[PDB]
Amino acid sequence: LDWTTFRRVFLIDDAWRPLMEPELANPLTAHLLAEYNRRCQTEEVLPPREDVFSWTRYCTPDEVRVVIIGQNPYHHPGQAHGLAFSVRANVPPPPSLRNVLAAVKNCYPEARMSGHGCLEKWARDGVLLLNTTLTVKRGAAASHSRIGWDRFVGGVIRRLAARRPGLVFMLWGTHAQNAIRPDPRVHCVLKFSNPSPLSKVPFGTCQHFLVANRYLETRSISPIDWSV
Ligand SMILES: OC[C@H]1O[C@@](CO)(O[C@H]2O[C@H](CO)[C@@H](O)[C@H](O)[C@H]2O)[C@@H](O)[C@@H]1O
């Protein structure tokens, strides 16, 4: 597994090399990539290839201030673009994203919200929106959850966390909470129910956005402007 080749294939930004290159030495990464490629040859896999690692482009590893974990990408064309929860700018926010934006609006009654659900602005500001499974077969939710992305992604998050003391993690729902278990004494770990529409627990009362900024300030880190 060669870094230059891998980087070129997925248009990965090079600032992430120290965090991702080590993952290429894990024998299981080769298996993951061969299976991902096998899937792309036999299915309409989403998001498009050039977007699978869009999260490496919006900000560098040292700019990450908050990590929000997702599960699987949207499986309808035109929705997913490589970031957890986010959808392309011309797509009315699906239920889970609508729920997240509503909590944001409840936390910040004055925020000037655009009404769209493209979280590129958050990503550029260092809010890492990462799915534990990066791809999916069109029309079949979570269809790629067993191909190996979760270990690769978890590895990257682990290296990022060791490199960076003081991160805020927002772990929403069971799956997110089981996949990433950051040292609570080194990082601010915030848990909540799932913004997924299947949850019968309202996501609207989530105050993580406010809690996160108070934490960042105690660590002399600039707060996040959550408007979007
Ligand atoms: O439902 C109206 C409106 O309420 C919001 C804001 O809290 O979310 C609630 O309702 C959803 C179902 O429509 C739930 O899935 C969600 O958990 C709950 O907080 C908005 O998201 C929604 O537009």
UniProtKB/Swiss-Prot annotation:
Effect after changing T174A: In strain: Nonneuroinvasive mutant HF10
Alphabetized UniProt keyword annotations: DNA damage, DNA repair, Host nucleus, Hydrolase
Active site (UniProt): N72 (proton acceptor)
GO cellular component: host cell nucleus
Highest taxon of source: Viruses
Catalyzed reaction equations: Hydrolyzes single-stranded DNA or mismatched double-stranded DNA and polynucleotides, releasing free uracil
EC number(s) given by UniProt: 3.2.2.27
Subcellular location, record wording: Host nucleus
Molecular-function annotations in GO: uracil DNA N-glycosylase activity
GO biological process: base-excision repair, AP site formation via deaminated base removal
Main location: host cell
Enzyme class: hydrolase
Keyword Translocase among UniProt keywords: no
Family: Belongs to the uracil-DNA glycosylase (UDG) superfamily. UNG family.
Function: Excises uracil residues from the DNA which can arise as a result of misincorporation of dUMP residues by DNA polymerase or deamination of cytosines. Therefore may reduce deleterious uracil incorporation into the viral genome, particularly in terminally differentiated cells which lack DNA repair enzymes.
Protein name (record): Uracil-DNA glycosylase
Organism: Human herpesvirus 1 (strain 17) (HHV-1)
Coverage span on the entire protein: 107 to 334 of 334
